[PDB]
Amino acid sequence: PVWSEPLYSLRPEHARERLQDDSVETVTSIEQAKVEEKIQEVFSSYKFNHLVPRLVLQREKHFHYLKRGLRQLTDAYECLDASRPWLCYWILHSLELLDEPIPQIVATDVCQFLELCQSPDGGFGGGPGQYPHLAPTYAAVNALCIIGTEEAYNVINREKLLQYLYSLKQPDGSFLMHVGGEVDVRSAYCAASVASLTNIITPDLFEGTAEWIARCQNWEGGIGGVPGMEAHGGYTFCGLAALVILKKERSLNLKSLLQWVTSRQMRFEGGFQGRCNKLVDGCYSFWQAGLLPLLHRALHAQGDPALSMSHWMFHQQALQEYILMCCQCPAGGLLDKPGKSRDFYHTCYCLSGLSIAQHFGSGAMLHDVVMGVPENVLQPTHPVYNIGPDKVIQATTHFLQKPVPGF
Amino acid sequence: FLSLDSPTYVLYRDRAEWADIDPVPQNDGPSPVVQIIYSEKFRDVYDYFRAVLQRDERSERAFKLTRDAIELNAANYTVWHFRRVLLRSLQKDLQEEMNYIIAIIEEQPKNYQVWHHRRVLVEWLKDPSQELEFIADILNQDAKNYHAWQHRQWVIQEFRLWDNELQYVDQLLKEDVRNNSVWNQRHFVISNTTGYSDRAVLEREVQYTLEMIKLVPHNESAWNYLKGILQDRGLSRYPNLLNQLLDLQPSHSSPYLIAFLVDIYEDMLENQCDNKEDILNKALELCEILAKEKDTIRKEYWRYIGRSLQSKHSRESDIPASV
């Protein structure tokens, strides 16, 4: 119809999705209301300006921001001096999603730089000369796989990497993030991700890891950093993804996990929050929504007959609207929410989340939903590794040609 | 000695007492990627840090240098590791170090390294006496600080400091009944003390939760807690719950109340209840109300639930194809 609004966030009924505080104000409701008011201004901007809404992913602008950042960063990134392989990964993946080729001058320089970050004892540190740590090791491996050249793959010292993982392994099944460091579910995921991609998984490497991860699932249905802690999207993604790699998703109560993640999508904003009663944030477009493809694959393997054949179990359209309308910086790059400034981390995850929301794939069945102009369509991303599915297949195939260190 | 923010702060390359050491520039390679254009102060401190780390110089001056390297980037885990090597090697007073970490955490509380460092100090000293009060101060500034709650659970569990926590939880729920971190802590305390199997405890918990639901019907945390403490035993195990929820529908409805009803029906159908069909239809009616009006953001989930309930609980579900 003519009066019919095609954008879900702009429909008149949508105003009914605003927060009902039951006239009981607390810090939580006050903060939530502030965000909703700011988001409402964004939604209403077209109407107040008397213009027809056009949802355009500013590719040109994002590309410029990424292309430059891959080479040089301002001191605004001093705080990430111990996470340089993450900067490589976040930027390269964003470029991959935007379907921008990685020049071989660039690819070779990234390889060399990551080699310099690699520790003599295995694993990668946050920069040259820094001790190896599982987070930058995960990022480094993903970045090298996105490049996917023989050179990129050859950078990884597989024997040392495996030795490194063992040196961090704990008796209870968990892993330290680095020598003398903290333990939380991120380590299980970082370790499983790199170990599976490079084919270094020995019979006992992950002994007890699945059980430890399962203990992190709490009364909410989601997964916390360590047993007993509040359920959070970052940790839940880590837990589920690690279990999927280990083929032990079944250790979790998948039903309560599904109920919890779906409840994390904000009715008004359309984006996802990290935990119950906190605020919406664009990076959860991946950490939270990315769980749906994982759950779909898991439930389907159990022969679930009620599973949709064209959509993930979240409002794909509303997530895309949230990202496109509220998370883009005019100068390039993406962000958390209106009021926040861009950064490569949110650029990587807002785009990853957008891709997930646009592409549904369950075997032979495929169905896209591309909000706004058709040029908005991004390259697909693998829900476990968050790198192109082709890069995943290519990397695993290549590494399966090698023998698991030691045999 | 000389704070990084002191107006009279001097770069290390201009300090007499450091004249014997040659700074070690960062090895970024011939054609850098993700190269950070560090400020003078940053690069200067880090070039000297690289020098002491490389030489493994375990000295008082190296110790003081790590404080500056940390101030510049408190997320540099390599610096924190070297600092712990120096604390042990130089036999530094750990309480003085506790004073230091409490100041650092106050300024950068959302950092992983600072909380882990404090944990190591507490383990070394085998003293948790300052913990609950310190953490309470951080929580007073951000009642949802994840690292803080996680450190608090560790302290309480490792040192068996359970005695006053429920009281603390009650205080925070009073301040903000919507604080999910506090509901999680409530569950943490009860699970590890009395447990939820004790009928008097479970009963008290549900009374309390329903009471909070009545006061703020749209607070999702109370709803999640109520379901969380009853779902494992089975929602159908508690026949009065349903009746009581239906009673709130008039003046206390929410998509949360409607969703819970579906969960109760779902379990009833799972544990072959009376009027199999009457229940199923009530559930599908609610799944539809949710997907189409009351909770559309979750339309794909509610459609799937309706489809699952239909798939295994319709009167035709157990009937052979031939019939």
Binding site: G234, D281, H346 | A75
Partner: peptide, 11 residues
């Protein structure tokens, strides 16, 4: 520049 209090942290 110091880490922004308004930003996310994953490591």
């Amino acid at each position: 520049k110091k880490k922004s209090k308004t930003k996310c942290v994953i490591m």
